[PDB]
Design an enzyme around this catalytic site. Structure first.
Site, PDB file in Angstrom:
ATOM      1  N   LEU A  15       0.841  -1.191   0.000  1.00 25.04           N
ATOM      2  CA  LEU A  15       0.000   0.000   0.000  1.00 25.04           C
ATOM      3  C   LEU A  15       0.879   1.245   0.000  1.00 25.04           C
ATOM      4  O   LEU A  15       1.551   1.509   1.004  1.00 25.04           O
ATOM      5  CB  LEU A  15      -0.861  -0.019   1.268  1.00 25.04           C
ATOM      6  N   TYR A  20       5.613   5.532   1.719  1.00 26.59           N
ATOM      7  CA  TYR A  20       5.273   5.727   3.132  1.00 26.59           C
ATOM      8  C   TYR A  20       5.941   4.735   4.090  1.00 26.59           C
ATOM      9  O   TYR A  20       5.651   4.730   5.292  1.00 26.59           O
ATOM     10  CB  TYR A  20       3.754   5.713   3.270  1.00 26.59           C
ATOM     11  N   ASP A 128       5.442  17.507  10.689  1.00 29.69           N
ATOM     12  CA  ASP A 128       5.481  17.145   9.276  1.00 29.69           C
ATOM     13  C   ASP A 128       4.115  17.323   8.592  1.00 29.69           C
ATOM     14  O   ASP A 128       3.656  16.485   7.814  1.00 29.69           O
ATOM     15  CB  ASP A 128       6.051  15.740   9.101  1.00 29.69           C
ATOM     16  N   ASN A 133       0.584  13.906   4.119  1.00 23.63           N
ATOM     17  CA  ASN A 133       0.547  13.325   5.441  1.00 23.63           C
ATOM     18  C   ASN A 133      -0.851  13.378   6.066  1.00 23.63           C
ATOM     19  O   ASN A 133      -1.019  13.071   7.259  1.00 23.63           O
ATOM     20  CB  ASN A 133       1.555  14.050   6.333  1.00 23.63           C
ATOM     21  N   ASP A 146       0.761  10.222  10.288  1.00 27.07           N
ATOM     22  CA  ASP A 146       2.203  10.191  10.095  1.00 27.07           C
ATOM     23  C   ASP A 146       2.896  11.026  11.149  1.00 27.07           C
ATOM     24  O   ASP A 146       3.320  12.149  10.916  1.00 27.07           O
ATOM     25  CB  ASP A 146       2.545  10.567   8.658  1.00 27.07           C
TER      26      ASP A 146
HETATM   27  C1  LIG Z   1      -2.483   4.928   8.092  1.00 21.07           C
HETATM   28  C2  LIG Z   1      -3.522   4.594   7.017  1.00 21.07           C
HETATM   29  C3  LIG Z   1      -3.389   4.641   5.692  1.00 21.07           C
HETATM   30  C4  LIG Z   1      -4.588   4.249   5.236  1.00 21.07           C
HETATM   31  N1  LIG Z   1      -5.043   4.114   3.985  1.00 21.07           N
HETATM   32  C5  LIG Z   1      -4.310   4.256   2.895  1.00 21.07           C
HETATM   33  C6  LIG Z   1      -4.865   4.040   1.643  1.00 21.07           C
HETATM   34  C7  LIG Z   1      -4.078   4.182   0.498  1.00 21.07           C
HETATM   35  N2  LIG Z   1      -4.676   3.945  -0.768  1.00 21.07           N
HETATM   36  C8  LIG Z   1      -3.871   3.464  -1.902  1.00 21.07           C
HETATM   37  C9  LIG Z   1      -4.464   3.860  -3.253  1.00 21.07           C
HETATM   38  N3  LIG Z   1      -5.922   3.702  -3.323  1.00 21.07           N
HETATM   39  C10 LIG Z   1      -6.401   4.150  -4.658  1.00 21.07           C
HETATM   40  C11 LIG Z   1      -6.539   4.535  -2.272  1.00 21.07           C
HETATM   41  C12 LIG Z   1      -6.150   3.977  -0.908  1.00 21.07           C
HETATM   42  N4  LIG Z   1      -2.773   4.512   0.647  1.00 21.07           N
HETATM   43  C13 LIG Z   1      -2.264   4.723   1.891  1.00 21.07           C
HETATM   44  S1  LIG Z   1      -0.584   5.180   2.088  1.00 21.07           S
HETATM   45  C14 LIG Z   1      -0.121   5.399   3.756  1.00 21.07           C
HETATM   46  C15 LIG Z   1       0.245   4.326   4.542  1.00 21.07           C
HETATM   47  C16 LIG Z   1       0.643   4.490   5.867  1.00 21.07           C
HETATM   48  C17 LIG Z   1       0.694   5.749   6.448  1.00 21.07           C
HETATM   49  N5  LIG Z   1       1.087   5.967   7.747  1.00 21.07           N
HETATM   50  C18 LIG Z   1       1.156   5.001   8.669  1.00 21.07           C
HETATM   51  O1  LIG Z   1       0.912   3.835   8.440  1.00 21.07           O
HETATM   52  C19 LIG Z   1       1.724   5.341  10.030  1.00 21.07           C
HETATM   53  C20 LIG Z   1       1.120   6.505  10.828  1.00 21.07           C
HETATM   54  C21 LIG Z   1       0.796   5.050  11.194  1.00 21.07           C
HETATM   55  C22 LIG Z   1       0.353   6.819   5.619  1.00 21.07           C
HETATM   56  C23 LIG Z   1      -0.039   6.654   4.295  1.00 21.07           C
HETATM   57  N6  LIG Z   1      -3.033   4.599   2.982  1.00 21.07           N
HETATM   58  N7  LIG Z   1      -5.388   3.997   6.264  1.00 21.07           N
HETATM   59  N8  LIG Z   1      -4.757   4.203   7.305  1.00 21.07           N
HETATM   60 CL   LIG Z   2       4.671   2.693   0.548  1.00 16.10          CL
END
Ligand SMILES: Cc1cc(Nc2cc(N3CCN(C)CC3)nc(Sc3ccc(NC(=O)C4CC4)cc3)n2)[nH]n1
Ligand SMILES: [Cl-]
Ligand code: NA
Ligand code: NA
Length: 264
Positions: A15, A20, A128, A133, A146
């Protein structure tokens, strides 16, 4: 108290396209629940646990919620509530502007100021703040995330370590110049975040040389008002970029201004 058994989660796919960390979407089998899972040898353990720790200390409707940790042995896990539409920057960039209208932009700003009013009250500092974020969920709910550099402050400022490197376009001048971070530095970033939202995900100071940014800012340059951005929002945005940190609005004032606008 927060610990869980890695066996509980089923990891489906990666993901984020690598932006990230090692983050995968996860399914908690016994609770039937979609969650995100950040995992870490990558000599960043010190700073991963620091992150896992701060998320235990904060709870707000507009901050991504920790559901549990696996921080007893590796791979270490961070399991948060799952936001099905991903990061705000790419959301804004890919959204249908007939759906994401000026009202929705205002709603997004109001919800973020809410999260930041709460941290301000808690004397926490995010360090940040940027559209990349923030995360987006159903019905245009936005939540700040984040928290890797986030901190409870002993007093009114935190000084970064020598040779720390920061995202300059989002960083307040006093942070660039003196490594000084405060809730007023978070206010500076918020302003840049507001400009990101106003422009549906444009890059700040487009095509300016990073090594000229401080110079320009000190001589008074600030980003121009985006088209469609209402004058009151631009005035507020400019307030966040006042040179002297003292002159910048509080997160309480800011949130009051957006809740009022969100009505009028
Ligand atoms: C934390 C979190 C993230 C999400 N959901 C998503 C969803 C996402 N997507 C990928 C692309 N589709 C088209 C949409 C959904 N991409 C990310 S990318 C991402 C991944 C992790 C973090 N941060 C963390 O995991 C750390 C703060 C706990 C930030 C962005 N995060 N739900 N909860
Ligand atoms: Cl990633
Ligand atoms: Na800057
Ligand atoms: Na200004």
């Amino acid at each position: 108290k927060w610990e869980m058994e890695r066996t509980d989660i089923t990891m489906k796919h990666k993901l984020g396209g690598g932006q990230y960390g090692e983050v995968y979407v996860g399914v908690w089998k016994k609770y039937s629940l979609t969650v995100a899972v950040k995992t870490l040898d990558t000599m960043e353990v010190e700073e991963f646990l620091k992150e896992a720790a701060v998320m235990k200390e904060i709870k707000h409707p507009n901050l991504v919620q920790l559901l549990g940790v696996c921080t007893l042995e590796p791979p270490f896990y961070i399991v948060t509530e799952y936001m099905p539409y991903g990061n705000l920057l790419d959301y804004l960039r890919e959204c249908n502007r007939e759906e994401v209208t000026a009202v929705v932009l205002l709603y997004m700003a109001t919800q973020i100021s809410s999260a930041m009013e709460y941290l301000e009250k808690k004397n926490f500092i995010h360090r940040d703040l940027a559209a990349r974020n923030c995360l987006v969920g159903e019905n245009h709910v936005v939540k700040v995330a984040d928290f890797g550099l986030s901190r409870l402050m002993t007093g009114d400022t935190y000084t970064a370590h020598a040779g720390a490197k920061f995202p300059i376009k989002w960083t307040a001048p006093e942070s660039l110049a003196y490594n000084t971070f405060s809730i007023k530095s978070d206010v500076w970033a918020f302003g840049v975040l507001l400009w990101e939202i106003a422009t549906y995900g444009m890059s700040p100071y487009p095509g300016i040389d990073l090594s000229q940014v401080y110079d320009l800012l000190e001589k008074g340059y600030r980003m121009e008002q985006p088209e469609g951005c209402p004058p009151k929002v631009y005035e507020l945005m400019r307030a966040c970029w006042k040179w002297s940190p003292a002159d910048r609005p509080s997160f309480a004032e800011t949130h009051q201004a957006f809740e009022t606008m969100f009505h009028d």
